[PDB]
Amino acid sequence: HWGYGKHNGPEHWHKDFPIAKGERQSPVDIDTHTAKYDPSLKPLSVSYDQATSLRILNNGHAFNVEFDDSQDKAVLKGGPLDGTYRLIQFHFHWGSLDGQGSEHTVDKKKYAAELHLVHWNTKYGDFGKAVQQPDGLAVLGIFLKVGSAKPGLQKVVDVLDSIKTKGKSADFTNFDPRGLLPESLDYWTYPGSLTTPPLLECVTWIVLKEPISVSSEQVLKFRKLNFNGEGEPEELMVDNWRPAQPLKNRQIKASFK
Numbered sequence: 001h002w003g004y005g006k007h008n009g010p011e012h013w014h015k016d017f018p019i020a021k022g023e024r025q026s027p028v029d030i031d032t033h034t035a036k037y038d039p040s041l042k043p044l045s046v047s048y049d050q051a052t053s054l055r056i057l058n059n060g061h062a063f064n065v066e067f068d069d070s071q072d073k074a075v076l077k078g079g080p081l082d083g084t085y086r087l088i089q090f091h092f093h094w095g096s097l098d099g100q101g102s103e104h105t106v107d108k109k110k111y112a113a114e115l116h117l118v119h120w121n122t123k124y125g126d127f128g129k130a131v132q133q134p135d136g137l138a139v140l141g142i143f144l145k146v147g148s149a150k151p152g153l154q155k156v157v158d159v160l161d162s163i164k165t166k167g168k169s170a171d172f173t174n175f176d177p178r179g180l181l182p183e184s185l186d187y188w189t190y191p192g193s194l195t196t197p198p199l200l201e202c203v204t205w206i207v208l209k210e211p212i213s214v215s216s217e218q219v220l221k222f223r224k225l226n227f228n229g230e231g232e233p234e235e236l237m238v239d240n241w242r243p244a245q246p247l248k249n250r251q252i253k254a255s256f257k
Ligand SMILES: CCN[C@H]1CN(CCCOC)S(=O)(=O)c2sc(S(N)(=O)=O)cc21
Pocket: 059, 061, 089, 116, 118, 128, 131, 139, 193, 194, 195, 196, 197, 198
């Protein structure tokens, strides 16, 4: 099965998921000089005050914090989006060293990690239907760099010991994802795909310009997780990122000058 190892990593995915070589694959490098300011873009609207977290889960590829998306509790709108998209989960991608970890890069710069807040377009009724549509998901991507601690990340970091191995989950209620946002909502946007199998081309990517800072100790705890299940040989969960894919016939738009 697919993973991030030498024998089942990104370079092999196309054999089971041929869309891996498709026309709107993610992630990509954001060339800041070629991206165009688009004054018709509207500000993002992130309304997370009513967000309800339920659970955190190690799924063998990352850890997901899952939310109740049975109603409009935590939603994203505005920007390039038409309609209302509901927050269903967030997760991270990270590296074995501070100089790598992000999926998107900026002028070829790699960050230590990348946060993905996954939202689905409510006009399609459920998440499973939304992924089959060109405008089905909106993912908010936020870069992490190593510096000062991010306080609002700490509750996530402290539960990681209870979900060390694949398939473990733990209750994770009353977590406020607002504590993971940077100060500015300036963004780049382009049409793309899931960055993991099944690699569906269903995503409107919204990547924030401003990284958040986390501490070395915070990221160190991400790297203590395992890809494997309990009682299998230990493999540290690190470098769970897909490299940049060709931009092809796409323009990246910027919300800011
Ligand atoms: C371990 C798989 N994670 C995937 C799959 N997901 C489910 C697909 C089921 O339906 C076919 S998902 O939409 O929640 C989502 S969003 C991203 S990313 N990295 O933000 O582009 C990856 C995923």
